[PDB]
Design a protein around this ligand. Structure first.
Ligand SMILES: *C/C=C(C)/C=C/C=C(C)/C=C/C1=C(C)CCCC1(C)C
Ligand SMILES: *C/C=C(C)/C=C/C=C(C)/C=C/C1=C(C)CCCC1(C)C
Ligand SMILES: CCCCCCCCCCCCCCCCCCCC
Ligand SMILES: CCCCCCCCCCCCCCCCCCCC
Ligand SMILES: CCCCCCCCCCCCCCCCCCCC
Ligand SMILES: CCCCCCCCCCCCCCCCCCCC
Ligand SMILES: CCCCCCCCCCCCCCCCCCCC
Ligand SMILES: CCCCCCCCCCCCCCCCCCCC
Ligand SMILES: CCCCCCCCCCCCCCCCCCCC
Ligand SMILES: CCCCCCCCCCCCCCCCCCCC
Ligand SMILES: CCCCCCCCCCCCCCCCCCCC
Ligand SMILES: CCCCCCCCCCCCCCCCCCCC
Ligand SMILES: CCCCCCCCCCCCCCCCCCCC
Ligand SMILES: CCCCCCCCCCCCCCCCCCCC
Lengths: 60, 216, 60, 216
């Protein structure tokens, strides 16, 4: 059961890293820069589901 | 920050290393090789992450940045992971040289491809991918057959470790394609973060699951 | 085992919905609009991990 | 598109409904009530999603849009889900009226809060949340104790269904807070997509897991 809380903790950490890129992009004033940062964050987070599932699967 | 992520990698790998050296202190008569191997897997990786965290080995390639230490890590540690899995499975030597060679081809192809600006990097990726399917076939096929002959506790630990490996190693080539070496949809920072997470699970997580079962 | 492939299929569907919002925002030319679309997509995807884990957990 | 997501909800709920009516055709002597209940849970929800897909019940509230059918759904179906779980657990009547009342308080508080522009909507949310913890206590506590007295196949199906419910219902209030009713960090579209996914798992997924076990 504790695995989830480890996974959840990391997943929000990763979100905060991705978000931090989006906002930096935003402060640029350039929408394209924000979109480039957003696509990276979406794809990263999708990929991150797969890692967590593997870790959950292997442990379940 | 890139170097912060590298430093978190180094610290994670270190903790794992110290954990495996400690746990190994009271290892059985033919179990030391397992503990030695895990100290090898996480210790090499720790040194690599330290090197990257210190800013060394950042190679310019076209419009991307390739971290040479990352790949030198993989070439050394991934076959050690395969050696570990070969131990639970109970391979003889011949079966080792096949899978290890397959594995080595994967990492070299990824590395080579990573270092090539041209579109032919995808051909190199192609070959790495084909070798990977070869490796997977051995993990789920013959090595699994081998592992079935062993005591059920070892079989169950094998399946558990094989599942974790096959599933998570299959994610790497996607990071390669979506990240800087491929279409550059993942920023360098996200690429590094995902790999750090993977490297910790495939090595340290892999290891702890083995500590859990060597007890239980 | 098939559950994962169901989860993976939906997770990429959700990514595509989120992404589709980011790009629409991008075509606006307004970086703030892209950031607002990006934060929604990041938080949604984080939340989406939790749903998939629950579905995996319950089934594992 | 919002109405496209609603239409996918409707179709998913329908499929589930038809599946439960069909599967129920050959139900045992005291199993019909289970199948009837699942047709109720997914059938009511299908009608709700159709209504939303047709553009009806979209309430303006301050700067957000509240879907009244969604909440009318919850008030009717969530207690039916709780009734189902009460059946596996083997509750008597008194134990039913507690949990169902708790459950009802949750949905009304969420609904009420959703319809309030002012900051006091969070107080309403507060009360819904406290009632939810009350409901959870009953699922994992007394109802679990109750369920332990039953045959192991029923116990195991209870734990499985209780886990799915407790985990996934706990996600709803976060969507409420991060979405339009709360801080509006999730766009309406993402809010609707997540809920559609949840409603399908908590009802249709919930149901199929029960079909799987009523066989096995
Ligand atoms: C601890 C570090 C580990 C387990 C690294 C594993 C890396 C791989 C499985 C990489 C696979 C790749 C392909 C299959 C295709 C070519 C690109 C590679 C090398 C990234
Ligand atoms: C099929 C539809 C289901 C299972 C809906 C479940 C909805 C909840 C568990 C909502 C819970 C809420 C709180 C706990 C706090 C107040 C906001 C609520 C109503 C969203
Ligand atoms: C687990 C691997 C993640 C795959 C991502 C799919 C989306 C890519 C579309 C371009
Ligand atoms: C236990 C040592 C610290 C681990 C941090 C891992 C961060 C991964 C990035 C997502
Ligand atoms: C600044 C450029 C220098 C590039 C040199 C490449 C770095 C060597 C890799 C060392 C990391 C791996 C550690 C494993 C040792 C056992
Ligand atoms: C590429 C050749 C390497 C083979 C090594 C394994 C030994 C022989 C097994 C057949
Ligand atoms: C799912 C991610 C897709 C990324 C698109 C990348 C485009 C090229 C991929 C080619 C890989 C196969 C090898 C081809 C040999 C030349
Ligand atoms: C549920 C388990 C699934 C395991 C999948 C592993 C099989 C191999 C997939 C990796 C393919 C790499 C190359 C991708 C080309 C695009
Ligand atoms: C499973 C619930 C998701 C919680 C999201 C956490 C991040 C919110 C920070 C503001
Ligand atoms: C089986 C019917 C279709 C289901 C679609 C669910 C979409 C959820 C959005 C994410
Ligand atoms: C345009 C505004 C009209 C708002 C009316 C509210 C809609 C009623 C809800 C119906 C959906 C629930 C179906 C359950 C019936 C059994
Ligand atoms: C709020 C009161 C509802 C109680 C109904 C259950 C019956 C009594 C159990 C004690
Ligand atoms: C994890 C998400 C946090 C969202 C922030 C919302 C701020 C207000 C939350 C208040 C909930 C408790 C009830 C307070 C009563 C007034
Ligand atoms: C691993 C299982 C975890 C189950 C969690 C359920 C417990 C209740 C949490 C819901 C709280 C709702 C209100 C949040 C306030 C901010």
């Amino acid at each position: 059961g504790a695995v989830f809380i480890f996974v959840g903790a990391l997943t929000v950490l990763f979100g905060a890293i991705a978000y931090g890129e989006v906002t930096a992009a935003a402060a640029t004033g350039d929408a394209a820069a924000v979109q480039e940062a957003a696509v990276s964050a979406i794809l990263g987070l999708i990929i991150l589901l797969g890692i967590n599932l593997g870790l959950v699967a292997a442990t379940l | 920050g890139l170097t912060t992520l590298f430093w978190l990698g180094a610290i994670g790998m270190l903790v794992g290393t110290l954990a495996f050296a400690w746990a190994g202190r009271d290892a059985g008569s033919g179990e030391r090789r397992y503990y030695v191997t895990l100290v090898g897997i996480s210790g090499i990786a720790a040194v690599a992450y330290v090197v990257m965290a210190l800013g060394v080995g950042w190679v310019p390639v076209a419009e991307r940045t390739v971290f040479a230490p990352r790949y030198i890590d993989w070439i050394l540690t991934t076959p050690l992971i395969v050696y570990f899995l070969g131990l639970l499975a109970g391979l003889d030597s011949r079966e080792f040289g096949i899978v290890i060679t397959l594995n080595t081809v994967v990492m070299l192809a990824g590395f080579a491809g990573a270092m090539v600006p041209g579109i032919e990097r995808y051909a190199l990726f192609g070959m790495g991918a084909v070798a990977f399917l070869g490796l997977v076939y051995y993990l789920v096929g013959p090595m699994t057959e081998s592992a079935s002959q062993r005591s059920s506790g070892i079989k169950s630990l094998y399946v558990r470790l094989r599942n974790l490996t096959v599933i998570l190693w299959a994610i790497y080539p996607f990071i390669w394609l979506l990240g800087p070496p491929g279409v550059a949809l993942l920023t360098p920072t996200v690429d590094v973060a995902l790999i750090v997470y993977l490297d910790l699970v495939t090595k340290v997580g892999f290891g702890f699951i083995a500590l859990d079962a060597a007890a239980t």
